[PDB]
């Protein structure tokens, strides 16, 4: 059916395992996936993987960026970039960091600099929305 091979440059999750539903939680718009699905290739967001492996398990965790690729025969490659868990995160660092991003966004002048501070502040705000 589907093989949800999750990976990240630190470690690998479920590589070669029968999974029933993966909330693939991306930039174009966070969408679930089941076994039979249309094949797709999409990049990720600072966003929120919710995996469900055949038994109603709800394991959610946070992903910086990466890439999802599914084929006809459902081989779900979710190659993330930094995949952290809810047992790994804190709150006040993200709060102070989004305040710093707000201040530097009020201080930005160049378009590349404003784009970097916007992706910084939206990573922080979707991060805190994941936190709370």
């Amino acid at each position: 059916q589907m093989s949800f091979t999750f990976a990240s440059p630190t470690q690998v999750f479920f590589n070669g395992a029968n999974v029933r539903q993966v909330d693939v939680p991306t930039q174009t718009g966070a969408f679930g996936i089941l076994a039979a699905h249309v094949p797709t290739l999409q990049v990720l967001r600072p966003g929120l993987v919710v995996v469900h492996a055949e038994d109603g398990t709800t394991s959610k965790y946070f992903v910086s960026s990466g890439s999802v690729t599914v084929n006809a025969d459902s081989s779900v490659q979710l190659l993330a970039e930094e995949a952290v868990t809810l047992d790994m995160l804190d709150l006040g660092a993200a709060k102070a960091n989004l305040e710093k991003a707000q201040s530097e966004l009020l201080g930005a002048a160049d378009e590349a600099t404003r784009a970097e501070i916007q992706i910084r502040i939206e990573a922080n705000e979707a991060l805190v929305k994941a936190l709370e």
């Binding site: 990976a7 440059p9 797709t40 999409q42 690729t69 084929n71 006809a72 081989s75 190659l79």
Partner: protein, 272 residues
């Protein structure tokens, strides 16, 4: 020889033997670290190769812009690694000399540009430095991707010549197809697939570059440490053999010096 000469030679080779055992144990420790780091990065890369194998898009012909990515070590003393990499690189360069033109290349490490100051000293476009000192990570592979993309160059085909790791003793020098422009991708198989718009697929393509470069760097560093441990094991053995031979000739030279001095003293006291 004289006696002090062989004493100097034995001192030198005993030191080279101890330092080569030290390099063998350092290569063993960094090999164990690279091997335990190799387990997640192998699955990551074979997943990327598996999605490009199921989406088995071919290569369009009759165009120019090719790219060879040499990924190997910066500091050698590790066997026949860079020889095989340079051989494969210039073989693909001679194959891409006919009917291809833009064989402008990128390479990492001092040894790849040092084995390329002569044959393709024009065509090496960017070079990297300090690989193989620290273990390879993802953010430095991001630096390689930024110096490939933001330093503006466009390419349609080529290869990422990476040192492939297979075992404690062996290795492999072989390529991976680097599908490069969206037109190579969006030809038929992406038209079968879904959500294959130009920006999403080209951001996917840049991330595929960072993916295969991460896989190549950790594969090359694991092969580096394995072959360096092998080379320092064999060099310690050859140095120990030559220490044994030079100790035998030191002893026979010592005995000859004692017998010569003794015959001179006895000849003097007898001719007195």
């Amino acid at each position: 020889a004289t006696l002090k000469d062989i004493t100097r030679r034995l001192k030198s080779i005993k030191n080279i033997q101890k330092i080569t055992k030290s390099m063998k144990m350092v290569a063993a420790a960094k090999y164990a670290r690279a091997e335990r780091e190799l387990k997640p990065a192998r699955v990551y890369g074979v997943g990327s190769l598996a999605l490009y194998e199921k989406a088995d898009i071919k290569t369009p012909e009759d165009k120019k812009k090719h790219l060879i990515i040499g990924v190997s070590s910066d500091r050698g003393l590790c066997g026949a690694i860079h020889s095989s990499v340079a051989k494969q690189m210039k073989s693909e360069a001679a194959n891409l000399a006919a009917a291809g033109k833009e064989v402008k290349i990128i390479g990492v490490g001092d040894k790849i540009r040092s084995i390329l100051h002569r044959t393709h000293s024009d065509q090496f476009l960017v070079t990297f430095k300090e690989v193989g000192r620290r273990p390879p990570t993802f953010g430095d592979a991001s630096v390689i991707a930024l110096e490939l993309l933001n330093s503006g160059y466009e390419f349609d085909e080529g290869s990422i010549i990476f040192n492939r790791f297979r075992s404690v003793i062996s290795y492999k020098t072989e390529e991976k197809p680097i599908f490069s422009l969206d037109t190579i991708s969006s030809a038929e198989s992406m038209s079968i697939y879904d959500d294959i718009d130009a920006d999403v697929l080209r951001n996917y393509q840049e991330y595929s570059l960072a993916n295969i470069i991460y896989y190549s760097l950790k594969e090359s560093t694991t092969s580096e440490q394995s072959a360096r441990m092998t080379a320092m094991d064999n060099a310690s053995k050859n140095a120990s053999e030559m220490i044994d031979k030079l100790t035998l000739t030191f002893n026979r030279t010592r005995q000859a010096v004692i017998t010569k001095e003794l015959i001179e003293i006895i000849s003097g006291a007898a001719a007195l």
